[PDB]
């Protein structure tokens, strides 16, 4: 009886941001720059866009030229540093 009633019930009742997840290989940076970013635990765009300029400058081996390249490639993809994210992770 329980089975039959439970079975009848059907008749009675009813009638993001992809670019932040993009792999670092898509970033097309210099080999040294990519290696340094990976060594600094920078493997995702989602965190990277949240980071600031000075933090990248404080990376021991990256120079102003590296910052210039990263800024140029971010601008060519409509992005930049220090963008604020909400409801992390996406």
């Amino acid at each position: 009886a329980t089975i039959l009633a439970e079975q009848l019930e059907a008749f009675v009742d009813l009638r993001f941001d992809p670019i932040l997840l993009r792999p670092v290989d898509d970033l097309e940076l210099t080999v040294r720059s990519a290696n340094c970013l990976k060594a600094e635990a920078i493997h995702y765009i989602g965190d990277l866009v949240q980071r600031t300029e000075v933090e990248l400058l404080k990376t021991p081996n990256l120079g102003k030229k590296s910052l210039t390249e990263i800024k140029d490639v971010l601008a060519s993809r409509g992005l930049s540093l220090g963008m604020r994210l909400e409801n992390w992770p996406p």
Binding site: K58, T59, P60, N61
Partner: protein
């Protein structure tokens, strides 16, 4: 002259240098600007009369004092 002649602060910069951390990594670790690190390293260079950090590091490691 002698590494023990340094101040505790200068001992800290000296030990961080001997541990292989670069100057900006030293600035990060101690949360100071590059200028103070430069000041400390230039005083070490002047007092120890040396040309590079590597010679001081290898001399520190030579006697296996630790």
């Amino acid at each position: 002259r002698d590494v023990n002649q340094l101040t505790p602060r200068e001992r800290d910069i000296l030990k961080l240098i001997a541990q292989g951390l670069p100057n900006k990594m030293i600035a990060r670790r101690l949360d100071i600007t590059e200028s103070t690190v430069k000041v400390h390293v230039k005083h070490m260079l002047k007092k120890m009369k040396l040309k590079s950090r590597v010679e001081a590091a290898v001399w520190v490691h030579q006697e296996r004092i630790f």
